Amino acid sequence: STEEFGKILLKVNQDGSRVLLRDVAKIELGGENYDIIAEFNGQPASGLGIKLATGANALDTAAAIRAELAKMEPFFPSGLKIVYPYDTTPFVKISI
Amino acid sequence: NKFQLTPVDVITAIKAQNAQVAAGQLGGTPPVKGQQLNASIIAQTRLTSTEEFGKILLKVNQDGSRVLLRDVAKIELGGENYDIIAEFNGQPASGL
Amino acid sequence: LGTATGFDFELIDQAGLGHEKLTQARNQLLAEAAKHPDMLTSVRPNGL
Amino acid sequence: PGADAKTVQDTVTQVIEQNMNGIDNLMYMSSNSDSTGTVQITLTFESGTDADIAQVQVQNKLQLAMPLLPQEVQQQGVSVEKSSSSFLMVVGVINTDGTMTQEDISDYVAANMKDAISRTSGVGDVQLFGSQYAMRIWMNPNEL
Amino acid sequence: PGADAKTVQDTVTQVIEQNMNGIDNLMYMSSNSDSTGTVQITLTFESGTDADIAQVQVQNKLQLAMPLLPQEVQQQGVSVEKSSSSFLMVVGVINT
Amino acid sequence: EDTPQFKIDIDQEKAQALGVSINDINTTLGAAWGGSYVNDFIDRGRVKKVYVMSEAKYRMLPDDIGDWYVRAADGQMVPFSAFSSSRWEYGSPRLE
Amino acid sequence: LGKKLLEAARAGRDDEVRILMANGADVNAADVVGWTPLHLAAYWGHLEIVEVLLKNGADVNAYDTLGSTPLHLAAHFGHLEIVEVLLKNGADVNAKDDNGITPLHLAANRGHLEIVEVLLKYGADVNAQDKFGKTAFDISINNGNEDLAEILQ
Amino acid sequence: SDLGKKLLEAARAGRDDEVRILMANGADVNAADVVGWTPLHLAAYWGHLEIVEVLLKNGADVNAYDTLGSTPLHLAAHFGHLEIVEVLLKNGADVNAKDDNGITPLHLAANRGHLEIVEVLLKYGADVNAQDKFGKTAFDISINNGNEDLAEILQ
Amino acid sequence: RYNGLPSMEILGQAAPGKSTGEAMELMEQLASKLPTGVGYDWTGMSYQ
Amino acid sequence: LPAGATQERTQKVLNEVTHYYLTKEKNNVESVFAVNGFGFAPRPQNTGIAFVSLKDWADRPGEENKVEAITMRATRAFSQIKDAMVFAFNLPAIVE
């Protein structure tokens, strides 16, 4: 927790007073990077850009991904929802 | 011996003065919202010549006179090893 | 192969509940399985 | 982290590139060294090359370069992947109740979803559109 | 050596598990971190998977994680082996 | 295309004279302006990274460079302005 | 319009620079780091653009957000013709950036002997010290440039 | 004893109906494991209220201390079991009990920010100026943790 | 841990005269009445 | 955007692209998944990408409601955007 990092003792002064990490830094739970920010129809979003392994079947992999996502959905926090904004497999299925 | 130095002082100096430092960015992420400037900070780069290695500062004496690497060593481009020497019909040669 | 008519079940912490909460959930499942001796026999933890 | 294009190229890219040899059925090799502190070296192989052996051989040569790489680069992880350049699909995640920010959703996807999708057979690469949470110590120079 | 279950899990097991990506024909992955100072991650693959290709892909991805493990664990080494629970014989050696 | 980048030169003689180590200079500059991955922590049962970096507002402007102090061997806090010089130059953001 | 002049000066587009100033583009238009068209022409070494900009009333002593003037850039990157043109148009030969570095300091460090002589001729101060108390002579000795050290007595 | 060890497992596991049978058969309530934890210690730690009440009714030592001097109230207070803290104090639990470190139930409650428990301990006469081996009060803990609510309560 | 998440392995068998599939069905029923964030999965012999 | 362009400038352009598809292409476009600081790979601040999913082919009758004509009109509209190379493209038959 931020609280525990906040009370990291950097030094004890000559008068006995303590310098904690929160005395010399703002301590928050933030991203590893702040480079990538996604939107879905204007709304705040994240997601997973999935790339097909060399020679692997696109439809079988897509099915295996949906099977794995189906496992996760029941344990989502309130409001969190999976959307399907880009898929190259439906056309393969429908065209065939 | 004359300047009271060892190979340890030379190796330490080369590591400090032949360095490629990652120094971050001006206006890097996450920025203060409204930042216009986004520039890479360029600190130390690798030395490229015998001249640059020669002027590596080892120490400064009490009288302000400076001991460079070229004052305790010869600086030149030379083989990683001097173990393999080839000749083509008695003529100096290299090969694969 | 193990035993025939024998099953291998995994209770999973799916929402960072932690060790203590998953133990309470395991004890809750083991307690209910013990109320069905007609169907389930020797339903136990494999761990410590 | 925090490296310019030249620092990346001259401490990572060139070191890995010089170790890429004794690799069967290699057509060509291309690399980028960005001021985002990132390098990507793509080795393209002859048609009908075993992608498993291609990865193994590239990985075999990378491990020889690993100890020469900076400690900060080793600790970020140097992945070797055998995938298409384009995306098979994008799995978007939103909060319809607007109870979670872009940062909250990104962390949840990273901590609860990404790993299982990455281990699924046929998935060559998974890109998080966002960041996993880290403990951020935002330092103040005046107070330091 | 001298590590509790949680120390092993939170500094070794979780780090290795997070880096077991891009490996082909993985059915499921299980692990035990215990206070004997031991982790064992078993990766079970689809029937008909080349066991050598399965092992080399796991082994290679472990090097993705090796620099992130504690120095003490890097020192002991992390063994990647094809799992087998059938011995030809046990040769006992005793002093009478 | 090439873009403006902030070239900073660490004066080795001046840093040596003030008793400021080059490792402390490079770490202070890199950590503050670029960020530094220190070690891992456990966020709700999952291993995640700990990053130190400057708060956005102290790594936006060129003049902010001089606000960062390094401690010398004698214990005196030395500003970056004391042992460094900077200029604008052009360089590649992406070398192929 | 002043933005298109900066880009045209950088690219070395002689014709474009004239067309933009025929429409009355700001000759002293500054980018995010404080570089004028004359700064960019001096850096990339576009002699023809340096002349065209100066005759249209370009600030010859324009300084960036670190105090560097076009003469600093031309002297440093070995643009002899541009150093001469700049100095003839009343460029400050003893100009100091925020670090106290002068055109002579830069030209001396990269070993541009031809440019050093031009700067000295236009009344460059040889005893001019930077923030670290270093002269052009101190640079010549440290670099081991013996030809340069003689010129600086 | 055989039953004493069975009561330790029952009290820990929260098996109320087993504890009921064990109390009837006379299972030793002062039974202790290697670390010196009684059935009451275990019940207080794992937060089993009914068993805490049943054990105290069957003449369990409310001020039983482990091999490092910790009492059930220490465990109840530290792990945020408000109802067990109340039941223990009503049955004469020493509110100012010091472990071998000089740590009190107030110290442990303060460290985990258990506001309700702190106020209950203060009500039953917890020494707010009580210092551990490091000369630290529950207030010093609240300041160090940055608990502004708790810091106010202890002032 | 099972598939990278905290887990607890539970072994058991179908009662005399009951099929493994029936015993598995009940275990799934009992598991669906556990606290929020507690999932389950079948491994080893049960999986295949 | 040209290198040196900020994350805020790229979001400004991504908003205009998202706006266009949600307003001018209501009948054809179902969803837009826009990512700031991403192209084909991560590239902070000056790069953005938009994944567009169209409605079913049945609901898009005629040639002018098909991908080729949609991306042509989109590319033409986005040509007006200042200091930005913005174009819509149908990924080919054999992408390789």
Numbering used by the authors:
A (entry chain A): 242 to 337
B (entry chain C): 194 to 289
C (entry chain B): 674 to 721
D (entry chain A): 50 to 193
E (entry chain B): 50 to 145
F (entry chain A): 722 to 817
G (entry chain E): 14 to 166
H (entry chain D): 12 to 166
Publication passage describing the model:
The E. coli AcrAB-TolC drug efflux pump contains the inner membrane H+/drug antiporter AcrB comprising three functionally interdependent protomers, cycling consecutively through the loose (L), tight (T) and open (O) state during cooperative catalysis. AcrB is the homotrimeric IM proton-motive force-driven H+/drug antiporter component which recognizes and actively transports multiple drugs (antibiotics, detergents, dyes, and solvents) via the tightly connected AcrA and TolC channels across the OM, leading to an observable resistance phenotype. Four different entry channels (CH1–CH4) have been described with putative entrances from the periplasm or the outer leaflet of the IM toward the two drug-binding pockets, the access pocket (AP) and deep binding pocket (DBP) inside the AcrB pump. Here, we present 13 X-ray structures of AcrB in intermediate states of the transport cycle.
